Design a binder for these strands. Structure first.
Lengths: 75, 77
DNA sequence: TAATGACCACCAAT
DNA sequence: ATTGGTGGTCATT
DNA sequence: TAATGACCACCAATA
DNA sequence: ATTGGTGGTCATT
């Protein structure tokens, strides 16, 4: 999983930079760097935006994912 | 609003009390010594709460961010 | 004209 | 059977 | 257990 | 109309 060093040390086309547990940083050509969270609700796949980076830190994105997991843990 | 400085210096009480941050987030301080984060929310009119973790393991900013995650989920719909 | 939510595919490992 | 990683698309705000 | 999710009354503040 | 802030309870695990 990511450190904040690995993120600034990146570089194309849209690509996903994975942390863990479905959380990733989306990098688009322009410089658009936005956190997202892959999840399923009773089988269906979606994603939720956790804000823009570096405004939203990695540890910020992680804690957002944590709160969301607790919500999804029911049920 | 809540600050960590306020939490640090909370007076002991014989009774549970809630210390409000904002947007439904509070710290529940129980007589014993336990301090736990809870978020007050409603899903289509029905009220509940979710535990966000023990303070200080979970910090004020940590809990706030768990809340911002949860609020984004709730904002659907 | 972006960003977001809602998906697709295959696949490995729990 | 379900999630998470790699790598994408497309419609609705 | 002590902590959690659900959810009560009363009302003030958002919206 | 809906939430957020007081201040509580209750039954499971």
């Amino acid at each position: 999983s990511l450190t904040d060093a690995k993120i600034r040390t990146l570089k194309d086309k849209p690509f996903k930079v994975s942390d863990s547990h479905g959380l990733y940083l989306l990098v688009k050509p322009g410089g658009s760097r936005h956190w997202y969270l892959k999840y399923r609700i009773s089988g269906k796949e979606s994603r939720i935006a956790l804000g823009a980076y570096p405004a939203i830190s990695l540890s910020d994105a992680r804690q957002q994912r944590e709160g969301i997991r607790k919500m999804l843990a029911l049920n």
